[PDB]
Swiss-Prot record, chain A:
The organism of origin for this protein: Saccharomyces cerevisiae (strain ATCC 204508 / S288c) (Baker's yeast)
Pfam families the record matches: UcrQ
Keyword hit for Nucleotide-binding: no
Protein family (similarity comment): Belongs to the UQCRQ/QCR8 family.
Membrane side Mitochondrial matrix: residue ranges: 1-48
UniProt membrane topology term: Single-pass membrane protein
Any one GO BP annotation for this protein: mitochondrial electron transport, ubiquinol to cytochrome c
Protein name in the entry: Cytochrome b-c1 complex subunit 8, mitochondrial
Stretches in topological domain Mitochondrial intermembrane: 80-93
Swiss-Prot record, chain B:
Lineage, broadest ranks: Eukaryota, Fungi, Dikarya, Ascomycota, Saccharomycotina
Function: Component of the ubiquinol-cytochrome c oxidoreductase, a multisubunit transmembrane complex that is part of the mitochondrial electron transport chain which drives oxidative phosphorylation.
Topology in membrane: Peripheral membrane protein
Family, as annotated: Belongs to the peptidase M16 family. UQCRC1/QCR1 subfamily.
Protein name (record): Cytochrome b-c1 complex subunit 1, mitochondrial
Keyword vocabulary terms for this entry: Electron transport, Membrane, Mitochondrion, Mitochondrion inner membrane, Respiratory chain, Transit peptide, Transport
Note: Present with 19300 molecules/cell in log phase SD medium.
Source organism, top-level taxon: Eukaryota
GO MF term set: metal ion binding; metalloendopeptidase activity
Name of the gene: COR1
Amino acid sequence: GPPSGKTYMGWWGHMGGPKQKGITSYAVSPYAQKPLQGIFHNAVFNSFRRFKSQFLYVLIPAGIYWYWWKNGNEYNEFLYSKAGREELERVNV
Amino acid sequence: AEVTQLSNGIVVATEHNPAHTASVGVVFGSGAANENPYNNGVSNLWKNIFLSKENSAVAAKEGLALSSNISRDFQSYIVSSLPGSTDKSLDFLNQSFIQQKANLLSSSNFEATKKSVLKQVQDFEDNDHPNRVLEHLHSTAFQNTPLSLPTRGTLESLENLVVADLESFANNHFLNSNAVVVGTGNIKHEDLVNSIESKNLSLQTGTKPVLKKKAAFLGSEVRLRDDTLPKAWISLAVEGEPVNSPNYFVAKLAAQIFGSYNAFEPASRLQGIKLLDNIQEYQLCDNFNHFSLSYKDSGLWGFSTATRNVTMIDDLIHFTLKQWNRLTISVTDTEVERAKSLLKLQLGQLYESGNPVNDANLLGAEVLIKGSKLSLGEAFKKIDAITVKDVKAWAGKRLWDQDIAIAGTGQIEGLLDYMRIRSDMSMMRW
């Protein structure tokens, strides 16, 4: 096979990153670990805090939008009822 | 054969075989495994004062040679001499372990000794990668347990150590009950036992050393990745068998099956090892060696290796582990036979060496645990007994689908995750 263009990701042994030195990682076999606890006592009061920060970024836009819809939605309802058959005939055509 | 052992006030053991010189030395049943994270490297620190220039000249004039050894399970201080000067030795051993237990530790010598091992250990961690990786293999395989302490001791706990620590250790460990004086070379048994019983006394008799907590294995890994290194050294093992174990030899024979290999030495590539077919097609590594490290509490069975083929490490491990799988399901008869012949061979060259300082370290360590040395002839009897069936049972307990310890340094980006390697410990079945 022929060569190919230079990508920004190789493969095991030459992944294309910076030379690493001084970093030492340690890990233990999943077999020597407690039969999957974590949640409740350690990672139960840690969760949801990961949507306490973000919450305002979603909520406000969702707020602004739900209000806008609900609001103009009520105006439709009014316009197409006796109470607004006059307002309607005005703002229609 | 020989090997004789007698008590007194202390316990003595000798093995004489008329050769050249003869060495006598005190071997203590405590070592690296009896240290703490913060006092670690104290024994390696004693080893260097005993071998200090100050003490070395005192024995050199007298015509003696000093040899010290620091291990996990034990410690040893040995003095070599001519066959006749067998008394010149004991008068030095005793002078340094009784009279000079106030000298030597004198500043100007301790500071000189300490600055020298602090460099000695700094050289080791910067250069001797294979042994460093192995040291870390113990470090993680037995982490937070006695066996996890590196013999040379850490570089930090070392520079915090002062004379007091040396003394405290000596007073707590160098004791009558936790010691064995040995004599190998050509010196007779009755010559030593009496020369020792000449000057009576005890020196801290009736005193026992502080005990601890039994060493244990843990499936884990430590990856000291260094991309600036030209190779990738890696060691990998499982929980082995401790000395004085039913399978002490069965386990040692299994390692001999896969043995050792040097890709550059023509004869090595011709060996009768099935694995060598898989590893030579794309030259997966420069070398590798299988071992069966045994100790008092536990052990490590696995292999070490160095490789320049950094992009195919995953296959080195793959093939190597697929072979280990064979010991549980398909190890052939001739594979076992070949192992015996080669086990006996390398086992013999170990015991039958032309250097008593080796023989001493072998006699001491054994009698310091089982209280007697197993005759080489007795070993061969056990080795030849071992059947294919034996190897499989051992592999079924020790090797098949068991946790593992991994350690590596250099370009190890290609060494896949723990779980990937761990998986290869077995094979699919119906």
